[PDB]
Amino acid sequence: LHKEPATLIKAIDGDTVKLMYKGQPMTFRLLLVDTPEFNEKYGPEASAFTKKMVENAKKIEVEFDKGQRTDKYGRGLAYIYADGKMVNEALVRQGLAKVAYVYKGNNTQEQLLRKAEAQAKKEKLNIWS
Ligand SMILES: Cc1cn([C@H]2C[C@H](OP(=O)(O)O)[C@@H](COP(=O)(O)O)O2)c(=O)[nH]c1=O
Numbered sequence: 451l452h453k454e455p456a457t458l459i460k461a462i463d464g465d466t467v468k469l470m471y472k473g474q475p476m477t478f479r480l481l482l483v484d485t486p487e488f489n490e491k492y493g494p495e496a497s498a499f500t501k502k503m504v505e506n507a508k509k510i511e512v513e514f515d516k517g518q519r520t521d522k523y524g525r526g527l528a529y530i531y532a533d534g535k536m537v538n539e540a541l542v543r544q545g546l547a548k549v550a551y552v553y554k555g556n557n558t559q560e561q562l563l564r565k566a567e568a569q570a571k572k573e574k575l576n577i578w579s
């Protein structure tokens with residue numbers, strides 16, 4: 451896989467962000483994770499986490515996996531990096547997302563994310579508290 455440029459347009463919630471990619475505004479849904487909705491427990495904390503991570507970044511990158519690049523709602527499906535740190539993994543590592551939505555063919559970072567989740571669970575962080 452490879453990283454491609456994007457710029458932030460706006461934070462949305464824990465696992466969705468609006469980015470400008472190839473010069474076009476798109477909502478991206480983060481691969482392989484599920485944050486709680488804003489109205490659910492830890493929802494706001496996930497939203498804030500992602501917000502801070504993407505707003506503070508000098509350099510946002512999009513990395514598509516090998517399979518489907520857009521979902522049925524027209525959201526881009528990607529691993530999103532903020533100054534080289536993967537947002538998807540960071541959420542999981544902090545117990546602010548679950549590994550989830552693991553479909554065959556867009557599952558390249560699965561084992562990296564599961565290892566993060568196991569460590570979050572060990573530490574009994576947030577969702578695992
Ligand atoms: C993360 C992800 C979600 N989705 C779809 C599945 C879910 O369909 P349903 O809307 O029918 O439940 C929805 C979950 O996204 P949200 O967690 O953003 O709601 O998005 C994909 O199709 N592919 C993916 O990789």
Ligand SMILES: [Ca+2]
Binds near residue numbers: 484485
């Ligand atoms: Ca969600």
